Design an enzyme around this catalytic site. Structure first.
Site, short mmCIF file in Angstrom:
data_model
loop_
_atom_site.label_atom_id
_atom_site.label_comp_id
_atom_site.label_asym_id
_atom_site.label_seq_id
_atom_site.Cartn_x
_atom_site.Cartn_y
_atom_site.Cartn_z
N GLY A 19 0.80 -1.22 0.00
CA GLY A 19 0.00 0.00 0.00
C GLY A 19 0.85 1.30 0.00
O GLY A 19 0.41 2.28 0.58
N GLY A 20 2.09 1.35 -0.54
CA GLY A 20 2.74 2.67 -0.55
C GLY A 20 3.75 2.85 0.49
O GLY A 20 4.55 3.76 0.44
N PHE A 22 6.50 1.10 0.93
CA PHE A 22 7.87 0.84 0.39
C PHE A 22 8.14 1.75 -0.84
O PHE A 22 9.02 1.44 -1.58
CB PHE A 22 8.06 -0.70 0.04
CG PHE A 22 7.80 -1.59 1.19
CD1 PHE A 22 8.82 -2.01 2.04
CD2 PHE A 22 6.51 -2.00 1.50
CE1 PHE A 22 8.56 -2.85 3.19
CE2 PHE A 22 6.21 -2.85 2.67
CZ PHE A 22 7.27 -3.27 3.52
N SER A 24 7.64 3.75 -4.52
CA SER A 24 6.99 3.68 -5.83
C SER A 24 7.40 2.39 -6.52
O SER A 24 7.86 2.35 -7.72
CB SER A 24 7.42 4.93 -6.56
OG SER A 24 8.81 4.64 -7.02
N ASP A 128 22.09 2.01 3.61
CA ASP A 128 20.75 2.04 4.14
C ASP A 128 20.14 0.63 4.34
O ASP A 128 19.02 0.42 4.02
CB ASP A 128 19.88 2.99 3.19
CG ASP A 128 18.51 3.25 3.78
OD1 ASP A 128 18.42 3.28 5.01
OD2 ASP A 128 17.48 3.28 3.12
#
Ligand SMILES: CCCS(=O)(=O)Nc1ccc(F)c(C(=O)c2c[nH]c3ncc(-c4ccc(Cl)cc4)cc23)c1F
Length: 288
Positions: A19-20, A22, A24, A128
């Protein structure tokens, strides 16, 4: 080009993964190959593709190609059918995790990283790494990803996984990734979100100026707890390399005492889960 290019119209997009949360990234089908894939949509692409073509290992997600049809850009890879590590860990399905499983997974991640640091034809320092960058393939193997989000030169709420030198924009070696790997391991053992509910800025402050580190449970077996302390040293040069982590994991695998120790720890989550909650209550109040 020197990398495979995939046409925008040879992809059928399904959902935005997670649903967004992680970014685009989408699950899709590469139509001409009849293959499921992931695509990360980008607004520009620099010289990433050139490095991604030369990175390939069983613990890193597989690069398949690039969309290059301005204004449309993106990176197409292997889709790992079992999703994010973060999501698995913080679900109750991860209650199945025992010693061996944690051993295998901690090994998968260390070997991927060792690859990127030392064995790939070009040296990649992730910078990261976190459980939201590790995914799970259908066979159960972990796959690192997002190692080209920097574009391989520092760009163009994930403080819990950052080494202090990273938090304060200092020179970064390979060992920044060792610290982050520590956090990941601590996640697999505790099956908690690190510094759950704290503010970013509070984490940063605490980690850097107070040498605050995640609460390691007192039942946590020593071997693991020391590994965590080692990966978390504020002096970066003291942290082990990934080859040494791998060597430590191996002698852990031969300790016949450790299975029992780890599994009763894992099974007594009932007990130690407010060791962790206590600290968080204390840290939330340190700001209120
Ligand atoms: C080759 C490396 C290229 S990179 O530019 O460094 N990184 C890069 C480039 C393109 C990407 F699509 C992704 C990526 O995100 C994923 C790759 N495979 C996946 N499989 C499952 C899920 C997933 C599914 C479901 C949930 Cl809920 C969460 C995640 C997410 C991904 C990526 F990290």
């Amino acid at each position: 080009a020197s990398f495979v290019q995939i046409k925008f119209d040879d992809l059928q997009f399904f959902e935005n993964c997670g649903g967004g949360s992680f970014g685009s990234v989408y699950r899709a089908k590469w139509i001409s190959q009849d293959k499921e894939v992931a695509v990360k949509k980008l607004l520009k692409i620099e010289k990433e593709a050139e490095i991604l073509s030369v990175l390939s290992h069983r613990n890193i997600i597989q690069f398949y190609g690039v969309i290059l049809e301005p204004p449309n850009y993106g990176i197409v890879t292997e889709y790992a059918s079992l999703g994010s590590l973060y999501d698995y860990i913080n679900s109750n399905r991860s209650e199945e995790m025992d010693m061996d499983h944690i051993m295998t997974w901690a090994t998968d991640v260390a070997k991927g990283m060792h690859y990127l640091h030392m064995e790939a034809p070009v040296k990649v320092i992730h910078r990261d790494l976190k459980s939201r960058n590790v995914v799970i393939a259908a066979d159960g193997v972990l796959k690192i990803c997002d190692f080209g989000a920097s574009r391989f030169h520092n760009h163009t709420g994930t403080f819990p996984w950052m080494a202090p030198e990273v938090i304060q924009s200092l020179p970064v070696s390979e060992t920044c990734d060792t610290y982050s790997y520590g956090v990941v391991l601590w996640e697999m053992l505790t099956r908690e979100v690190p510094f759950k509910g704290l503010e970013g800025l509070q984490v940063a402050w605490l980690v850097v100026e107070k040498n605050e580190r995640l609460t390691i449970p007192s039942s946590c077996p020593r071997s693991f707890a020391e590994l965590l302390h080692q990966c978390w040293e504020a002096d970066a040069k003291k942290r082990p390399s990934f080859k040494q982590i791998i060597s430590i994991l191996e002698s852990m695998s031969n300790d016949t005492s450790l299975p029992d120790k780890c599994n009763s720890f894992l099974h007594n989550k009932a007990e130690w889960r407010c060791e962790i909650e206590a600290t968080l209550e204390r840290l939330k109040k340190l700001e209120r």
